Structure formats: C-alpha cells, structure tokens
C-alpha cells in the first residue's frame, strides 16, 4: 500500500532536489504537493510521488517513481504542466535527475 | 522492503554526495561497503538505499533510522572512521534529516 524502494530497478527513479530558504520552504512544499495532487499522479507511467521537507528549512526533495524515464520527461515537456511548475521555478532552481537504485537493505 | 510513510514512523536521512563521473563508481563502492560492513549493524538502523545518478555527478543515500540520534551516534563514533574517511576523500557529503510530508502510490 506504500511506495517501496528496491534495487531491482523495475521502475525509473527521479530525485529532484529543490534548494530553498526557511522562509520559502513551506510555500514550496505546498506548491509541489498541489502539483502531485492535481497533475503528477495522473500522468501515464506514474508510479509514486514522495515529498520530503528538510528539518533545517533549506531543502525540499521530491522522490518520484515511474515506469520509464521517458514518462517523467514527457510530463516536463508538456505545456499543460506549466501552470503547476511555473510558480515552483519562481521559488527554486530545481535540480532534477534520474537514478539507479544500486543497493537496498532493510532490517 | 523500505517503505515511504507519511506517518514518519522512522527518521529519514537523505544524504547527498556530489561527485564527478570518474569518481562516482569508486564512491558508490565505498558507500555500499560501509553499509554492509558497518551501517546496517548500528543500533537503530532501519534501512539503507544507495542511488547512483545516471549522469555520473551524484550519489544519494536514503537511509531510515529509529531516531535521528541513532544516525548521529554512528557519525560521532570513532569506530566509523575507517569506513567513512575514504568517502570524505572523494566527496563533501551534505547530510540532513527530512520529514516525509506527502506520499502517494498507484495501486
Ligand atoms: Mg553487492
């Protein structure tokens, strides 16, 4: 019932790092959660979205899973995405990237 | 498997290790070795999840703990230095604790 991290790399994984400032951080979080609620979760190939707020106030991290990297990229290229992503770029210079999960262990 | 929960049952660290393509696999190898030989045996350890950016410029460790204090205790322990010193030779890690504020997954 929850997003799961596993090194089979069945999914593509993006870790988007949005550096911020403490006074902007919650506004940035709210915008990202709105995008997920209203746009991102409905994209073809979407698997999961997981928004993390740094306790020190300087960073937001969006951990998102997709069937293929192309599904995330298609979303970013879609002009329909601009109403949701434009205010985010007003607050932060997001650093987006795909990752391989090369090691996962749980107790 | 490691699960992302908006209940924040566990503490979450997202440790960011900037690097460069020629160093990245050596860094990954040293981080995974530390996980298998040291981190996973620490009190309070819940999970370790090492991610290698496809572009060669970053390694991200998503690790879960009983309490933030358990991770901090490991970092402060001089017994960790043989595993962690070679990593610091490759990268200036930016580590920090996070709150999971939003999670969603397809069914
Ligand atoms: Mg191995």
TrEMBL record, chain A:
Pfam families: ABM. GO terms for molecular function: monooxygenase activity. SUPFAM superfamilies: Dimeric alpha+beta barrel. The keyword Oxidoreductase applies. The keyword Transcription does not apply. Residues 12-102 form the ABM domain. Keywords: Monooxygenase, Oxidoreductase. This is Antibiotic biosynthesis monooxygenase. It comes from Streptomyces kanamyceticus.
């Amino acid at each position: 019932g929850m997003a799961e991290i596993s090194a089979d790399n069945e999914f593509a994984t993006f870790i988007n790092l949005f550096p911020t400032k403490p006074r902007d951080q919650q506004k940035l979080v709210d915008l990202i959660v709105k995008a997920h609620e209203e746009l991102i979760r409905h994209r073809p190939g979407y698997v999961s979205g997981n928004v993390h707020r740094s306790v020190d106030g300087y960073q937001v991290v969006d951990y998102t899973q997709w069937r293929r990297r192309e599904d995330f990229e298609a979303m970013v290229r879609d002009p329909a995405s601009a109403p949701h992503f434009m205010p985010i770029g007003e607050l932060t210079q997001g650093k987006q990237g795909a990752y391989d999960v090369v090691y996962t262990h749980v107790t």
